[PDB]
Amino acid sequence: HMDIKDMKKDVKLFFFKKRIIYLTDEINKKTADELISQLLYLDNINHNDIKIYINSPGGSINEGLAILDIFNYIKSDIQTISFGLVASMASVILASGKKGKRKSLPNCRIMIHQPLGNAFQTKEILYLKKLLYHYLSSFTNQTVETIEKDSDRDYYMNALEAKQYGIIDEVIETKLPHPYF
Amino acid sequence: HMDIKDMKKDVKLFFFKKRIIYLTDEINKKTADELISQLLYLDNINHNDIKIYINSPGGSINEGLAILDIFNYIKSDIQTISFGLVASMASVILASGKKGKRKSLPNCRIMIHQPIQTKEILYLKKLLYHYLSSFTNQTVETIEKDSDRDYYMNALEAKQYGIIDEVIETKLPHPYFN
Amino acid sequence: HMDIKDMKKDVKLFFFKKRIIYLTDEINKKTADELISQLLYLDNINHNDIKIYINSPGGSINEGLAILDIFNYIKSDIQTISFGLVASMASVILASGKKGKRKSLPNCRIMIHQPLGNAFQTKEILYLKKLLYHYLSSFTNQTVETIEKDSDRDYYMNALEAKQYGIIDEVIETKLPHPYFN
Amino acid sequence: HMDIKDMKKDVKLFFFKKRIIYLTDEINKKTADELISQLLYLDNINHNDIKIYINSPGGSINEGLAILDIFNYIKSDIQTISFGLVASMASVILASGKKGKRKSLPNCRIMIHQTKEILYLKKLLYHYLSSFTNQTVETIEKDSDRDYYMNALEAKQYGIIDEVIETKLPHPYF
Amino acid sequence: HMDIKDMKKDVKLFFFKKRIIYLTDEINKKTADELISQLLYLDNINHNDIKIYINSPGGSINEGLAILDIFNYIKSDIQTISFGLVASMASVILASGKKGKRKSLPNCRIMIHQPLGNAFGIQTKEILYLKKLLYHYLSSFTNQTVETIEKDSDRDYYMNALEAKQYGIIDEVIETKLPHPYF
Amino acid sequence: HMDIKDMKKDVKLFFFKKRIIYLTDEINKKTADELISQLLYLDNINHNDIKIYINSPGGSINEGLAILDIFNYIKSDIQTISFGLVASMASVILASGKKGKRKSLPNCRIMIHQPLGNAFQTKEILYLKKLLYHYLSSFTNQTVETIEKDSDRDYYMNALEAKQYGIIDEVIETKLPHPYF
Amino acid sequence: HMDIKDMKKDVKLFFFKKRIIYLTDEINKKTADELISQLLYLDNINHNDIKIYINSPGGSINEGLAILDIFNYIKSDIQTISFGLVASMASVILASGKKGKRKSLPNCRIMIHIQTKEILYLKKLLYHYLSSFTNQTVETIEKDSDRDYYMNALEAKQYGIIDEVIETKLPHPYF
Amino acid sequence: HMDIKDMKKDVKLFFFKKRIIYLTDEINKKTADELISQLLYLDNINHNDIKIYINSPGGSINEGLAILDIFNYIKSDIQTISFGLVASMASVILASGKKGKRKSLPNCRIMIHQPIQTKEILYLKKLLYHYLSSFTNQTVETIEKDSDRDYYMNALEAKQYGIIDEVIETKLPHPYFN
Amino acid sequence: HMDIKDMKKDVKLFFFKKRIIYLTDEINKKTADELISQLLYLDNINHNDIKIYINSPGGSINEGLAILDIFNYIKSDIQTISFGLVASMASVILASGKKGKRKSLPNCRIMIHQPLGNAFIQTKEILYLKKLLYHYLSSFTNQTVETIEKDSDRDYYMNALEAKQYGIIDEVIETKLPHPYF
Amino acid sequence: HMDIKDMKKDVKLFFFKKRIIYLTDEINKKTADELISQLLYLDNINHNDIKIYINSPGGSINEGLAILDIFNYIKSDIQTISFGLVASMASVILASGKKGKRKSLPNCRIMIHQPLGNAFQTKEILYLKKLLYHYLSSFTNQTVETIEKDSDRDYYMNALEAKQYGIIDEVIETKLPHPYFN
Amino acid sequence: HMDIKDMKKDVKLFFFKKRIIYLTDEINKKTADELISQLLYLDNINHNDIKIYINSPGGSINEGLAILDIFNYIKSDIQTISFGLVASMASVILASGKKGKRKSLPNCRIMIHQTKEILYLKKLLYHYLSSFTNQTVETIEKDSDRDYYMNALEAKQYGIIDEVIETKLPHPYF
């Protein structure tokens, strides 16, 4: 069978019912609101693992830290899997997945900086970036100086580099080998 | 049971039925009107606690005070829980929650600073300070002073300030809290 | 029992079936038409009291006066409760509720003038404002001279001042006292 | 029982099934077409009275005359009731209602007001208003050129309506 | 019996099921396509008379001539009734109704020219060709000569119901409870 | 001779130096400002008559009354001559010319109402119109009721009707007779 | 010699000092005001003839009549010469020229074709003037004014709009 | 002599040289900057009286006060003459003219009513009332009261109010004055 | 000696005083008016040959015919020289030049149709003008009306040489650079 | 003697030749460039005092600091006089005038913060603000902590408060006393 | 005597005649063309030093290299002086000034920062900056990727300028 009346909304619903969520879009008020509702909704059903595919350029750091709070508030473990492009807050969210369950497909590009811009209060923007660096630091074991330096120079990592960095635990093996691994 | 057909509207509906509302947008005519209708509706069902998640930059003082009135017009207690960013009118609403049931997530950022006859805009601001004053046990002088200096507080600072009663514990410690 | 499939339309419908309407938007062609349809529909069901929550800056005096006509045309008595901000025709509609049944929440700000502007023919605009003052006069017992004077100076009233003015019968007391009341 | 699953569309439908229509919009191609369909539809169910609440600033004269043609094409009597503002073409339609069944709420305000074609239609429009009100074509012409609003009572005395619906609220000027 | 669920779609649907169609929009690609679909659909059910109310300023002559082709392609006869304003191809369609079954309400204004403009959309020679052809078809429907038709069109000639009948566009003017001041 | 370097500005200057001004445009702040400066400038040279051709739809009543004040403040007499279309404040200005010196070309259309609109404070708009009616009343000998009624009905007058009304003193005779005179 | 500084402003100025004006624009408030200024100015210098080339689609009827008055108010004769395209109010101005001195070039195209009661009054008035300028009946003027009719230079002469068709080194295919 | 080449710029220049300036536009950064420069320039030439024709709806309070300062910084006296419409900041400037030399044409309409940190907007308004108060000899209370009720005065009323010293006589009597 | 004050206006003025004009822009009201005033001005100085460089896509046919009228009105002969792109009315103007004095540069492109669009809508009038433009070109090139029209309908582009053989120009100006197809 | 042909440009020029400049516009690329050109030009003529009237909300701190550099680079001493409103870099430029020569008209409003917004790279914006505070600190004798605190709360000062703050040396007394001064 | 009849255009002209130019705008087609004409013009009068005040955010690399080509085509020495902000292409131009004659005001902020073509130009640009500063192409590459501003003194130590013009105002961080 395949009880589906819609080819978009019903497909996402199918995965949602299997505890699989997609964070494949810019992080903003609306996006973080939907994701938070969903996480809370699922954690209410049971405390089994939740899988979140991540392909986002990031966005608002405030919204990301809100998502990060919910991530660590619910009981269910969260395994993160990235693909496409992941940046800033999206990378920190990727890195906060349950240790050992943070993965990434081969061609994913991962970066610390924000490709959408520092804009989504001068001192507040800095405080949030510094804070973001601290969380990434605790998730990757890298020092804050390193994280900051790498963010300032717009450092782009491949899946393997992200793993060596400490952002993910393993690079998912595919039928297609990566030319530089 | 998993009686969900839509993944956005239906999820919110599910929480609404469990007396949980999300005030995660700007406060204006439309938004205030939806919340009050929802509050009055929930209070008509029964008088159990109503939970309100707050993530808002603020908005209309007039609409904010209308929400404040409805908060205190209904029988059910309202527990406020902030996350993300809460400012101006949204902070007062967070603080106006049931004493002892006002909470906040670790990384939330809370700001007082606020700012159409001129005489009215000031009367409303002075009135806001008084309410925030009785909610936090801070003098009106202090409130006004802190409101003029665009300053963000972390969750713990907001608690010490009297805006919330406790910081929700998380599996992730805050680098600046304990 | 929560038999709702929507969080907006259905909530308003739930209240509509309990004879409760929300006049919480600018008074214009579209809103006046909807409110009038609703009042006539409810008065067709039965003639029990109808409650109308009001939070509006007003708008078009013509449409406002049309609502006033339907208001006084139906058999059902009307209870008016204001919150937020109420002005111009909204205030008049508020003041037209059944005597003893006109209420207001503590923080409501009430005014006679039009905050959205006198622009929803000069002589006709004047004619409607003067007529509005007359109706408010008969609802509050204030003289038309007073009403107009207060309107021209953009006078804002708190709930208690509105009661003393004669616009409402009482200020609903809540769990939160007002800094300048009693 | 209030079996309406909507507060805007369903309320209008409830009245439509009770032969009640609302003409509270500018008179244009779309609204004329809609109204005409509705009138023709009701007249096809039976020929009982049809009530039309009017509150419109007017609009297309051509589309107004079509509505006028349909008013007098159906067998059902049409009773017009105005509230709010009624002007130009909308006033003629209010006036064209079944004699003796044209009413208005107390605070309603009523106003009467290619190149050779635009004038031909105005002239013709004056004649219709004339027969509806018993005022001479000259008086209509004159009163329409000076943009002037009438109150409900004045509209009755003019011959546009037959009666002013009384309400619990007396009009200060009547 | 009023089993209607809306005051717009369902009302038109109720008339459609009764072989009644409305041509109250401009004649363009979209509206011509719908009308044609509807005509072909009805004629597929049975071949009884199809009634079409017309209140249109016309539009595209190509789309107009297309509707005309469909008109004479189907077996069902078509009685046309005009009201409001009818022009160009709309007038021609009105005139192509079953002889003896072409009507018009009293206040309708009928003209030959295009009030929306001939550039409705410039291929000059083709525009002229489509108009001359339009004139010929109208000529064969009203018995007027192509010369008269063209002259009248070029001078933005507006006719009243009666003048339209005398011209040969409609067969009769429907009597109404309200007599026309100039009839 | 004909010392002219420009075919627009220099032509107006030529007339200005002969005490001839043109009020052939909408009456607004800028327009009234230029006209007032000019009148004051000329009255400073000498007190000989000033001729003002008027072809204006009017505009701001406030600005018109300002012009009207200056008109009656300078010592020089002002003869007004209209052509084209003259309305509202433009008509009042036309009518305030020195009695016996107010003229109009044959095809000029004259009206009291405003073809540009009452907009250029409800009670203030009425006060200004009422005031305008009073000035026109004193310039034409017509009553204020008449003026107001004629303004309300958008009354358009021909040159001869304007003279009978009392707005102008004479219709300038041209080589072309008017079909209705 | 040639003392012109630029090929636009100064060329028109040169012709202007020779009492030659170009009315090759649309007729509106600004255009009429300028033309009226220029006519009054030229007539103030002396009263010799003033030549006006016309190539205009027309425009405001009020401003057109204002020009008409100024035409008959000044003492100088005005010989109108059309070319390109002349329509409506511009055609009336063309025909309003001094009888016998109204001309047109070979290929010029000529065509006769805000309260309601006013716009009507102005058209009627326009017909009467055009009528007395062409000796055509008021009915004819109106009839032709409704059928968007274009006339060649010769037809305009026969109609009474112009007095003669300027001859040129190039014969007209239909003349 | 008639040394005029332009009919707009040159006419104003002629009056400027005769110490006559036209403040017939809105009061803003650009306008205030032109007037002050002009005033300082005229005062540098000599100290004879400077005449200023005023027809303005008002504008920036900050720029208005800057003009008020320059008015009182220069040695030359400034006589203000209003015509058309004068409101808000423009009325204060008219009233700030040299006592005894403040005039107005018959049909001029004068309005007090005025109305970007909120606290500042009020400080400026209160300050304006004081200045207008000393210029008119009206109490600050009266000024503020009349400013709240959008009310236009005629030339004579403005004189009785203390804004101007006299109404310029004209060959045309005002239907409501004598 | 070069006593110029600017590289644009004065350079054109220099040529103007030498009876040389540039018709290097779209033909419209403004352009026709300027060219016409210039032709009349030069013809007023004397009757010597007037040279006109042409590089225009054409434009309004009316304005073009007006220019053509002035061309044959003035007494001075006019020699046309084209370069770049010449189309529609611009081409006819090129062909109307003094027989034997119509020249063109090698790389010039010439067409009869309108590249800017036949819509510089009175249909019959537009067709009357197009047809009226053909005869004139016909008389200028000896080509028949059918040929001119046929070639105009198929947006036909000619090179300098083909233009001469067509009868639009008398000779192709020789240059230090030979054309790859001549 | 009034040898002026213009009422704007020439008035400013008359003052420029008397070593008086007007910094009365938002501080941006264009205005800073012009002011800098002017200062260098004047200091090239001679080294007498230069007077600068200031009425500006400030703008770009980079450009403002550039003006500050040129200010202190030239030999000529600079007298600064403020009126209207002065903020951010404008205030600093005001405070940088020759000690004892920094004046202000009575009604001037002076502030440290940027009324046009901190938006003329985060760390660089912070770096420039901190640097601005330092310069103002050395010009007023206030501590950098104080300056920043006052800036963060959008502190507005009247002329007298500005003098006591150390931004100006004296409040010019005019014919009109200030309601809250002495 | 101050014989300037304008306060903006004439002031610039006065300096131009004293061989002083201002490059205080974005580097684009128009500004490059203007500057190049000015440089070529001055070099044609004589070959004395030409001073160029620089305060620009940068711009077109192609137009920057053209200016660079012209800098080294003329015989006159070009002394560069920066103030305000100097970035990217504008920094290279500042650096390309005559060795020993490149200066900067105390508060100046200096920053170094088709598809295959855009990269080819950046690489080439790094080499030029390298020879001008004595920093290896690697250091330029690295320092340009991390968007970082230098103060006047740091710019000198980097090799972009030769000296920091001293003023009556000391810099708090020097």
Automatic annotation (TrEMBL), chains A, F:
Active site: H113
The name this protein goes by in its record: ATP-dependent Clp protease proteolytic subunit
Source organism superkingdom: Eukaryota
Protein family (similarity comment): Belongs to the peptidase S14 family.
